[PDB]
């Protein structure tokens, strides 16, 4: 008992720290943009559960018993269910709002904590010393299955979903990386939170539990890490894809055009790298990296068209001099979207 | 309605000179180009030369470069086509169609409306 | 220089089933491919321009698809106005159109 205190301590003491830091960090940089709302509020949900819920697993430990009335008991197994229900349910939010985000280039976070909030209710009910009441037929049987089906089954699922259309989305890069950040926080998630969800399934259907209390507390002091850890900006204050290939790849292809034409002799080299170049310019223009990029290459078209017609007139050098606008154009206009892959 | 006529078409010797003209009523000519696209008897379709109204830009393809002349006149709305030194390989149907002018869906429509063509026969 | 060559020089079925015609690009053209049909002493008619949109005011019937330089020409139901030639051409530019050799479509007996 020594040591499940003292192990609860040290998790109570690196949570707490861990939060504090985190939330500090990003109150200073924000004194209000997404991530860092969603971030935060992750944060705060897990200060609740190291509040509510692992600091009364140490009280009740200290002395074997409840120390209270009836209604204490309610409140705080309310709001570790609450919490409880909270860590999944912005972790679901925050993939929703990463999947938004790269859909096209807080109302969530509200929505989850009424969730929280209302499917913990019958947690006033339950607990009344607060010895737990059971239903007649089996009463750990139907909560316990109903706690597992959603706290772990239908949020992790649901974001398994929206982590498959994002990744169809973004296949189809700051996002990326918050991607890859939500991820691997929803991924530490279900690592830390599965054992426990399957033993008490286990105990409900077939009528030792410190080391799995031990590995679902390690959930609330790794997220704030890894977070801090993916975060550059965070760091700094403590101390989609298939279209823009294409896009490159034409763009590649009229620069070698532009650098045929500059060497070209003759009429008909400059009307071939044309047309290669007109081609090259509709192809790109089919693909989303709208209405500036699509008159910018309109502009470019009407270009390759112009020297053509210049080409056709036997006037080479004529044409090789309108088609030197056709590099100021791209400076213009194809190296601005290229530098959207910043964003991606 | 819009659409496109052609007139002079006939018999002529080899090596002679005819012009084909086409008349084009419900639309100016100085929205779109206006192209001739000939078809032999029994052959498939084979694009001749076109016209720029606005830019004046023409051309023609290889085998009726330098003895085809094709222009334009916005007064009547109407193209000329002259052809000189016409060998017996010109006996044929020309068509005339129109092609809208770049940027937007137009030029996508690549000779939405035809002309009935005329027939163009040489011998001797 | 670029030349389309449609495959099928001569095709046969009978009424309501589906044939595809296909036509191949020398170079890359984008989908600037038009799909025309012509009765014998007709003018040609449009029916399907950027290689996929269908012409306004045919019918329905007539769909088109691109795959790299690979265009085709499907018709799901054949009707007895369908038995015509069809001919492919690539618009690239005014003065570089070239069409193809033509597919005529007659009645399986």
């Known amino acids: 008992a020594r040591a499940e205190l003292a192990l609860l301590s040290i998790v109570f003491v690196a949570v707490a720290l861990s939060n504090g830091l985190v939330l500090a960090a990003l109150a200073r940089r924000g004194r209000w943009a997404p991530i860092h709302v969603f971030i935060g509020h992750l944060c705060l949900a897990d200060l609740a559960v190291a509040l509510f819920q692992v600091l009364p697993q140490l009280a009740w430990k200290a002395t074997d018993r409840f120390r209270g009335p009836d209604a204490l008991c309610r409140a705080v197994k309310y709001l570790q269910m609450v919490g409880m229900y909270a860590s999944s349910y912005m972790i679901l939010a925050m993939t929703l709002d990463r999947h938004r985000a790269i859909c096209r280039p807080n109302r969530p976070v509200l929505v989850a904590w009424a969730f929280s909030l209302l499917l913990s209710l019958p947690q006033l009910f339950i607990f009344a010393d607060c010895w737990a009441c059971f239903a007649e037929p089996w009463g750990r049987r139907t909560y316990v299955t109903w706690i597992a089906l959603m706290v772990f089954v239908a949020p992790t699922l649901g974001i398994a979903a929206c982590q498959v259309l994002i990744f169809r989305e973004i296949h189809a890069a700051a996002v990326a990386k918050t991607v890859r950040m939500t991820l691997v926080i929803v991924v530490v998630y279900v690592l830390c939170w599965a054992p426990f969800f399957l033993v008490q399934l286990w105990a409900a259907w077939d009528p030792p539990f410190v080391l799995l209390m031990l590995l679902a507390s390690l959930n609330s002091c790794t997220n704030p890490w890894i977070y801090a850890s993916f975060s550059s900006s965070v760091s700094s204050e403590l101390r989609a894809r298939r279209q823009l290939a294409d896009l490159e790849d034409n763009w590649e292809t009229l620069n070698d055009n532009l650098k045929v034409i500059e060497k070209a002799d003759n009429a008909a080299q400059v009307k071939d790298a044309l047309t290669k170049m007109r081609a090259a310019a509709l192809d790109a223009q089919k693909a989303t990296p709208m209405k500036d990029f699509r008159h910018g290459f309109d502009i470019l078209v009407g270009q390759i068209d112009d020297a053509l017609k210049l080409a056709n007139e036997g006037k080479v050098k004529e044409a090789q001099a309108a088609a030197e606008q056709l590099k100021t154009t791209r400076n213009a206009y194809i190296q601005k979207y290229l530098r959207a892959r910043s964003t991606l | 309605e819009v659409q496109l006529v052609e007139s002079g078409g006939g018999l002529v010797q080899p090596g002679g000179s005819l012009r084909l003209s086409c008349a084009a009523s419900?639309?100016?000519?100085?929205?779109?180009?206006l192209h001739w696209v000939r078809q032999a008897p029994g052959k498939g379709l084979e694009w001749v030369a076109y016209?720029?109204?606005?830019?004046?830009?023409?051309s023609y393809a290889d085998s009726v470069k330098g003895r085809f002349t094709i222009s334009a006149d916005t007064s009547k709305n109407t193209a000329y086509l002259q052809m000189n030194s016409l060998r017996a390989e010109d006996t044929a149907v020309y068509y005339c169609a129109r092609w809208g002018y770049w940027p937007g869906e137009p030029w996508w429509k690549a000779f939405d409306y035809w002309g009935q063509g005329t027939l163009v026969t040489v011998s001797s | 220089d670029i030349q389309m060559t449609q495959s099928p020089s001569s095709l046969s079925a009978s009424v309501g089933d589906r044939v595809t015609i296909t036509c191949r690009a020398s170079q890359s053209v984008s989908s600037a491919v038009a799909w025309y049909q012509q009765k014998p002493g007709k003018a040609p008619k449009l029916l399907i321009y950027?290689?996929?949109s269908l012409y306004s005011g045919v019918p329905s019937r007539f769909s088109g698809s691109r795959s790299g330089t690979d265009f085709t020409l499907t018709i799901s139901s054949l009707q007895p106005e369908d038995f015509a030639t069809y001919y492919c051409?690539?618009?690239?530019?005014?003065?570089?159109?070239?069409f193809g050799q033509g597919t005529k479509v007659e009645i399986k007996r």
């Open positions: 051409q690539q618009y690239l530019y005014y003065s570089l159109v070239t």
């Open positions: 950027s290689a996929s």
């Open positions: 419900g639309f100016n000519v100085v929205d779109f180009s």
């Open positions: 016209i720029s109204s606005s830019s004046g830009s023409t």
